[PDB]
Amino acid sequence: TAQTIANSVVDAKKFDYLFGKATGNSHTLDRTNQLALEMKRLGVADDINGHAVLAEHFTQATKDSNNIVKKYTDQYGSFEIRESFFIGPSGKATVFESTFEVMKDGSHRFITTIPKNG
Amino acid sequence: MFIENKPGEIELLSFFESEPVSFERDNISFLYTAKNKCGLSVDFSFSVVEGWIQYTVRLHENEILHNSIDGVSSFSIRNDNLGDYIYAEIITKELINKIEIRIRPDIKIKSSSVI
């Protein structure tokens, strides 16, 4: 398991953001309330199962090439936005709009995500 | 969401009369700072790849105003007879949000949210 998280696209630092613990600063937009409330709504707990569920989903979201809705490239690198459907243990559902960087070695780096319920 | 229309790095250099204080590679985000001579300062930051703008106002290094705007796809530097200002507009079906930030001749922020 804890290696599933290690081979994922979600860095360990990003799991604080996903559970509403990435407190804001000049380079970080504070979305702690929104993300914490959504994870509770979806039934994703801040435990090992919760991390593995998200890790697997955002990793799997990079494997389909037909869910890319926006691309952007500048002098720093190449980035993309992906839509992905997620139903959680509570049975409530959302669509995650996730942003990745497309690395030079081809892998995908999870940057952020927003749930869009409606 | 990507900020696809932003002032060029030179335009921001003129506006803030300084390079960015710091750059974050993870989310292509920049922090700029401006001060007046009375202890009032303003921190303006934005992330090109996550699509947001933030500003914090400090009086004597105490934070008095903080605003954060999500879903920015563009912002611009505009001019009227009073001077230059950063302008950002977020338009949705029900709501229109605007912000207007001046630092010269004075630090002055004007924002609104209409249905």
Resolution in angstrom units: 2.5
Per domain, the residue ranges of chain B are: 2-115
Indicate yes or no: CB of B28 within 8 angstroms of CB of A74: yes
Q: How far apart are CA B16 and CA B18, in angstroms?
A: 5
Angle at Cα A8 formed by Cα A3 and Cα A13, nearest 5°? 95
For A:2-61, CB contacts with B below 8 A are 24, 26-27, 29-31
Q: Kindly list the residues from chain A whose CB atom is less than 8 angstroms away from the CB atom of residue B68.
A: 24, 29-30
Q: How far apart are CA A15 and CA A40, in angstroms?
A: 14
Residues 6+ apart with CB under 8 A from A46: A19, A39
Contact of A79 with A73, CB cutoff 8 Å: yes
Evaluate whether A107 touches A90 at the Cβ level (below 8 Å): no
Instruction: Please name the method used to determine this structure.
Output: X-ray
Q: B31 at the A interface (CB within 8 A)?
A: yes
Helices (H) and strands (E) in chain A, counts: 4, 4
For the CA atoms of B90, B92, B96, B101, what is the dihedral angle to 10 degrees?
-10
